[PDB]
Write a protein that binds this ligand. Structure first.
Ligand SMILES: Nc1ncnc2c1ncn2[C@@H]1O[C@H](COP(=O)(O)OP(=O)(O)O)[C@@H](O)[C@H]1O
Ligand SMILES: [Mg+2]
Lengths: 788, 754
DNA sequence: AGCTGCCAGGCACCAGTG
DNA sequence: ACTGGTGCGTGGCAGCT
């Protein structure tokens, strides 16, 4: 096993190892001329993941070196295979110039691709956020922080406990999570994609204040509302140190951070988010969710924004009224605005690629195209009487200048890259038209020299061509070549031709090639100059992008209210919900039969409904529809009902039924307040008959009598219908069933009162439990009903 | 590409891989389907590299999709149930074609394994045993009749194939099948009066033959599977016992994972088949028993030799289809070289079955010797390029190779001659398709090329040339090589000629080797893991002393606690109270698996097991609705020979209704049915059942409060449970002191009256 | 239209002339 | 020390069919 000290290595392997040791945990692509290459175990892994050959590399002393690699022009394809598997790559490039370089040319890692810091169009999902998060734990709480690199959205929060932290990880769903080496509660995080253990020094607070002030160009973070917040700042510090280290360029689009407080949003727990199928259904897919229904936005950025609001309802009455207003003002204007807004596309990600300086030609094209829709959007929106719509008309901006620049700079449909030129347009730079001018002897000159030399020699097989390896030539067939001028110089031989070079062609080769390299460089100077001219207006460009996404959202929720018959919610001071004719938004589109609308009435005097009714009677659904109506109302949307009054809701809790059920329930009892909506679905599990019910009863009583929260409480325990009798705030409601003949009818109708009876025997009969057994069950029931 | 849609008329219901360069390209609506099933992208194009077609065909084919290749006209069709290439199968898993069919009377069913020739039919009467047969056999491809009524059974299955009604005609069926097997009638196969099943098998065989476009000389038999030959296990039971597959779709923490230490892939597949089809006939069981005990001693000697034998079943398939590539032959040779050693080790085992497996096994010495002399030690994957046939097998071939080598030797020396005659140290001789051989000088030295050298190609740093002498010897090499390659192929096709007449005996060998793999494994497993030989009794009853869950005991690193079990007709039902937390559930399932293992012929995880005849095994251990429907199936279909295992029915409905259904169920199962039953319940009110009816007793699990925890004991005790622990766990989970207090009052109040 | 085989641009290696 | 040949991934495409 070779001892491999520094001197045992070649100049190349020495250099490769310094850089490898900057990032020992992750794959390193190492630029060698036209190939990106990997070595040692990296090569063996790449070989297994990227389906390429594992080969070797000769060595004057000792062991051979395992090696794999791909040509430079295929990189993006392979990076996609790797980031789709949760893998990071450090990309190493050549900085220097081999000709002014005795040893190996100089080499830096210029970039690291990681699942959380990708900004390229090919490696992302259009309609779905891809966040980088940092997390860390204290002796009292959590610090958490998300950055979305391809928009600059930088956020900070300090969840108070395990279950709020869990709910946050579920909500943000980071593609990559940096977490501190001493994180205690690993069960929040174990089994998460993109997990990245970090050293504790990256979470040091004085360094975080330093990075973030530096970054934001401030002295303190008071203006951002986070000087207050050292737990969170330490995740933000780690997160930004990383973003920086993966990008290794400045990041002008990350110009701010905001704190997400408990009190600004309704905080749904983890069960709640799952039970309501907000963007992922219970089997993991995106069919039959809230979002499948509501989301008909016409730009990717507008669909992501919608999904964030759905997930994070604001509590701010002002903001909510504003959004509701906008939705009603724009009812009519949707069919005109939507086709036009669709042509804005994903402006937000393009400006991100603009700030990272990675934007390609078609990115500037689509940006130019976006600016071209701004006038038509301005004209439509002028007529809409709504101060909120006008603020969003105003934030949208116009950018006449920058539009006119991209029309005079890029051609109508440029190629995918700038590497191959043919991107910058005519008239933009008069030195460039002049450099193409000279490299337009390709048309005229060559055909003329050809026909001239064909006529002159009388050699009819004579052609003129170009070949990358040997340059220009004059071909002559093998059978005519013994007849060519003595002047003609052998350049390249072939099985049945002989190609030649004379001084007039080689002169024309020296000027085509060199004028073409001069013209390409210039084009790249000019194309990177588009960034210098576009970038100073970046602030307003991001505000334009966000304006347009918000518009896309509100216009969408305006169309959805109209189409699916939703009305405006009103807000009240105290806790309570009053629905007239509410429907479950999702279930009312999938069902082929018609949806039975039911009411609800929660107040402080009527703050807990014990809900009976048969299995399949519609109990769960009535509970979910309450939470979704409350949810849509607190994103500012119209709501699926004839009428809705609703008061302030701080937090929604769900428990849907061993230890986990009890623990979940403890948390409901410790953190629920009079402002929470609590959904308990068929809880209280014991080991003997009355064990678990005793527990639900005690729990219910705590919710009614001590916590006084708003509680929908579905049960099959008929014994809990005796709760109202005994408890202030508690009422019985029930889902009507109908036992005509021998079968059962599920009315999905909510009535007031306890049910006339439970229906368990009936459901069993339905499932084909033999008649003879149902007969005896009915006998014992009658026995049990005589105790009381 | 207007000659694409024309070809998708030819075969429309099949994905159409279309040659486009170094790629196969799917277009309109095959491409939609293809980018969703394989994670690759679309533009309506889709694409895959040529180097990975078998790698992308194996995915599509194990999601129930046929694929048609195109190179132009459709040159190849692979279907899921008909593949036999080793790159396209999973090494340790059966892959079946199946046909299904219905009658006024009932169902017909057939299954083929195209690689082993294992052909089987059956005639399930009710639909639930038809469902049962579909989960067990789990075809990769399902042929069903057009005007088939009960689509509910086969609706969600992958690999469905709608078929004309005439493909199920009984007279076509009998006549095909008899033609396939060389018989006038099917009486020697035991299926002549099995028309429902025959129709299914007549379709199946038709399809097989059509997909192959060959003889299938290896399918020479069919067998009826009968209801009474087997312990019937519904899908739900099969799934809850985690036999091959775990409740969470994986292959671990399963019975087959603990017990499957077979050494050959064909022996692993056979074991899994026994594990899903326990037999009622104790004769076959006493025999497997007797064999495992006979071999406990010879196991260490046998398994490394058998491991070497590999997959002789699937190689023989490829021998019968005539597709067996040189390594398939090289590894059949290796298998043969183990038979004499295998025969020596088994010589002394004093059981008549091991000696029958030893005769059946065979030796085939002169076939061993034929391939020792025919093929080289490590031949290439394909015959295509030769270097497979051995030095000294055939006179002509060595002659043609010696002429090639002497032409190729000349040319290595032509290089040293030209280079010593010119003084040009960069001169060499190479070969490619464009030029044949050529002298190559480098660019810097090429201006001193002899004037007799004719230039044919200029590279960037070299020039290449030909001379007459170079082209003359190119002729000698290429004609020789070509003749020796044509001959290699002819010689290799002649191995198929000489091997195939013994195909029957070879299949009997692979089969016998498979069983031996299984029994040698079941025997190592019994010994290693302290199992015991179960005795069988006449009337029903299970009696276990210190028995264990075979899987939980290897997986969980905690002390497994063993438990007794006494069921007879005077003690048919145990009401099981106390905590569950899987303790009850492990206890119940372990009864099922000990019974299951008894009835494949294996040893079992206990110190003693006596067990009576069992016709079915029901295990409702796992909505309220599904629980009632599974329970309803138990009550409609259980007999006094069934083992029934119920987990706490009544949960998820009112106390009284669910107590009422529990009670009534247990009555039924104990009085009417009289099945052997473990009825786990939470209802303490059911513990008054032994007092009211004969045959019922009370067992329970207890638990132990200590330090700052609870200890759920794993131990079954007589009598009803004295305690509940819902509240105890509640306390330990953080539920406020005072909520717990209130709950404790209410509990006393509710139980109080009872 | 297909199939085979040069080439890319780094670096190190290696066998032959100081 | 130089000099001039060698080898090393995958993919693009010239140069033959
Ligand atoms: N109000 C309604 N109108 C029409 N169908 C309904 C309604 N409520 C429920 N359903 C139907 O009944 C089914 C059962 O709903 P669920 O709330 O789960 O019943 P439960 O929870 O009482 O067992 C749902 O899948 C839905 O299709
Ligand atoms: Mg429910």
């Amino acid at each position: 096993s070779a001892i491999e000290n520094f001197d045992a290595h070649t100049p190349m392997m020495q250099q490769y190892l310094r850089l490898k040791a900057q990032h020992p945990e992750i794959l390193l692509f190492y630029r060698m001329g036209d190939f990106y290459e990997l070595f040692y175990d990296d090569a063996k892994r790449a070989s297994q993941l990227l389906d390429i050959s594992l080969t070797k590399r000769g060595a004057s002393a000792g062991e051979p070196i395992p090696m794999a690699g791909i040509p430079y022009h295929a990189v993006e394809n392979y990076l996609a295979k790797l980031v789709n598997q949760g893998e990071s790559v450090a990309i190493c490039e050549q900085i220097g110039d081999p000709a002014t370089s005795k040893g190996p040319v100089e080499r830096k890692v210029v970039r690291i691709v990681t699942p959380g810091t990708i900004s390229d169009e090919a490696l992302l999902q259009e309609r779905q956020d891809n966040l980088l998060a940092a997390i860390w734990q204290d002796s009292k709480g959590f610090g958490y922080a998300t950055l979305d690199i391809s928009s600059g959205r930088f956020r900070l929060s300090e969840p108070a406990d395990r279950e709020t932290m869990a709910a946050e990880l579920q909500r943000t769903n980071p593609a990559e999570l940096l977490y501190a080496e001493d994180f205690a509660e690993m069960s929040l995080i174990e089994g998460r994609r993109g997990l990245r253990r970090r050293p504790l020094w990256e979470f040091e607070i004085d360094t975080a204040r330093q990075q973030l002030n530096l970054q934001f160009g401030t002295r303190d973070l008071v203006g951002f509302g986070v000087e207050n917040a050292p737990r969170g700042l330490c995740a933000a510090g780690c997160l930004l140190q990383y973003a920086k280290d993966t990008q290794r360029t400045t990041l002008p689009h990350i110009r701010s951070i905001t704190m997400e407080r408990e009190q600004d949003s309704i905080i749904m727990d983890a069960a709640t988010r799952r039970n309501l199928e907000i963007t992922q259904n219970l089997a993991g897919g995106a069919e039959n969710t809230l979002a499948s229904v509501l989301d008909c936005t016409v730009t990717p950025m507008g669909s992501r924004m919608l999904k964030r609001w759905l997930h994070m309802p604001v509590r701010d009455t002002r903001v909510l009224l504003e959004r509701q207003q906008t939705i009603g003002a724009l009812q009519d204007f949707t069919a005109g605005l939507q086709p036009v807004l669709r042509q804005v596309g994903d402006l937000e990600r393009i400006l991100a690629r603009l700030a990272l300086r990675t934007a390609r030609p078609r990115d500037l094209a689509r940006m130019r195209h976006a600016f071209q829709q701004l006038p038509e959007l301005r004209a439509q929106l002028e007529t809409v009487d709504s101060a909120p719509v006008q603020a969003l008309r105003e934030k949208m901006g116009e950018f006449a200048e920058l539009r006119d620049l991209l029309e005079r700079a890029i051609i109508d449909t440029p190629p995918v890259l700038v590497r191959d030129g043919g991107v910058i347009a005519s008239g933009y730079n008069e030195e460039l038209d002049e450099w193409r001018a000279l490299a337009d002897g390709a048309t005229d000159y060559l055909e003329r020299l050809e026909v001239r030399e064909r006529e002159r020699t009388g050699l009819d097989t004579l052609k003129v061509g170009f070949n990358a390896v040997h340059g220009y030539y004059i071909q002559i067939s093998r059978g005519q070549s013994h007849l060519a001028p003595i002047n003609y110089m052998r350049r390249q031989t072939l099985k049945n031709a002989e190609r030649y070079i004379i001084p007039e062609l080689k002169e024309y080769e020296d000027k085509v090639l060199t004028s073409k390299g001069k013209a390409l460089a210039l084009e790249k100077q000019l194309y990177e100059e588009l960034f210098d001219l576009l970038l100073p207006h970046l602030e307003a460009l991001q505000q334009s992008a966000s304006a347009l996404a918000e518009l896309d959202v509100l216009v969408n929720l305006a169309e959805r209210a109209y189409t699916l018959n939703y009305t405006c919610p009103t807000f009240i001071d105290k806790p309570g919900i009053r629905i007239t004719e509410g429907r479950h938004p999702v279930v009312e589109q999938v069902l082929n039969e018609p949806f039975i609308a039911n009411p609800l009435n929660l107040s402080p005097q009527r703050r807990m409904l014990i809900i009976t009714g048969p299995n399949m009677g519609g109990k769960s659904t009535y509970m979910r529809q309450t939470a979704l109506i409350a949810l849509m109302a607190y994103i500012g949307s119209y709501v699926p009902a004839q009428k809705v009054e609703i008061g302030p809701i701080d937090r929604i809790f769900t428990r849907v039924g061993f230890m986990v059920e009890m623990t979940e329930t403890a948390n409901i009892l410790h953190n629920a307040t009079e402002y929470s909506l609590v959904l308990m679905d068929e809880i209280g599990r014991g080991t003997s008959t009355y064990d678990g019910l005793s527990l639900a009863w005690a729990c219910a009583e705590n919710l009614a009598n001590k916590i006084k929260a708003l509680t929908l409480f579905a049960t099959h325990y008929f014994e809990l219908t005796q709760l109202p009798e005994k408890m202030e705030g508690v009422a019985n409601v029930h889902l009507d069933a109908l036992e005509h003949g021998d079968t059962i009818a599920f009315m999905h109708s909510v009535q007031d009162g306890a049910a006339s009876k439970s229906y368990g025997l009936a459901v069993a009969a339905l499932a084909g439990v033999p008649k003879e057994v149902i007969k005896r069950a009915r006998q014992k029931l009658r026995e049990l009903e005589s105790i009381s």
